[PDB]
Design a protein around this nucleic acid. Sequence first.
DNA 1: ATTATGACGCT
DNA 2: AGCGTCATG
Length: 430
Amino acid sequence: GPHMATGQDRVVALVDMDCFFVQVEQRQNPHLRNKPCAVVQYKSWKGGGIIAVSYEARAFGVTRSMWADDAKKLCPDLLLAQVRESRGKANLTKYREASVEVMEIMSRFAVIERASIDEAYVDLTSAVQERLQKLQGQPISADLLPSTYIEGLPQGPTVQKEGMRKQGLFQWLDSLQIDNLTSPDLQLTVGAVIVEEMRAAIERETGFQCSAGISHNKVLAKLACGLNKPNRQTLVSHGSVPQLFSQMPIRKIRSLGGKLGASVIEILGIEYMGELTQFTESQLQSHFGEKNGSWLYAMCRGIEHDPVKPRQLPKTIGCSKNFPGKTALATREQVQWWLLQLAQELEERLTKDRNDNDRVATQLVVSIRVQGDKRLSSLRRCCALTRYDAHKMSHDAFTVIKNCNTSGIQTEWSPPLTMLFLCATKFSAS
DNA sequence: ATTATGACGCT
DNA sequence: AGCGTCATG
Ligand SMILES: [Mn+2]
Ligand SMILES: [Mn+2]
Ligand SMILES: [Mn+2]
């Protein structure tokens, strides 16, 4: 009735860089621009594993996780850029620095939450109130929203993509009641104006294009961002949620793409996010736990309260390498050499971090995988991180993993190691 | 033999 | 603390 809280109090955007590592490489090498191209890690095994794909190449079926040799079967003219290798491993510094460029631009408009190397949520509620006070009642011109889709429109009583985008936007803007600064649809619209400006600033100042979603919470903003890529933004209003969710597979919503979403589907006998509305909050909590159940109950109605956290920097700084199949580490000298390689990269990144961000890590986490273990991590052990020195860090990691060697020979390592991972955590202002 | 990250929930 | 899940450039 009048006391139902519809979760329309915030304006939240999710900005995601289009095929990010590809764009970084295309900015650096103009010969790659506007071409089918992909970014690969390594090269010897099947041409390298693809981790990013330009939209031109996606049209040929090239995807992330493809081996480049297989991708070349789909797209023989595919161009490839390789991630830098340093100390025997992939080194992603170039992409982390490019990410910082984008994040610093976004931070000029509002508080952001770094959600990945190429995406950030934006809490625009306050910026929207500001812009609405500046608009002094003036209507919102379509010219202010030149790359915005309104999800669900056009509807009701041109066969070109841009024509439909414009028709839907016109329908939306024509319905807009711009006379109260408290309408959630108006607030979302102003949010989209701001996101147009933010995306223009990112492209002007970095060369990088991005997509974005604008809605009332993080989950809807992320979902919205995916609806119209690349180089476009999408507004998902509260009112669009019933129709949008009525045919939305459950796995498309962030956090439901894995085992939990599979159990929602199997236990409840449903397929689409909207079907969740027919269950009581207690029913959902009974199957999926109190937190998940309350979250699902609100989220299938378009409502979620998870805040945009004020955090532009990563909480951990880590280094990892797999040693698959026959290249697993089987001698103590091997394990120690690779721990040193990882620790040297970690030292370099940590020292840069301390200089840039006025903080120091205080905990070192060591994770390994042993051959024949199905898990991603066989074992995790922590120890104190008291100095940014790679030799000490690698000695300490060896000390906390040494008792895993079930070999009679101390020169051999059994069972061989298929993964090493060093992660610095628990940062403190320095 | 996708690999290299990173956040967060659970107990 | 150590383990598992989700995301996935
Ligand atoms: Mn992206
Ligand atoms: Mn992303
Ligand atoms: Mn992606």
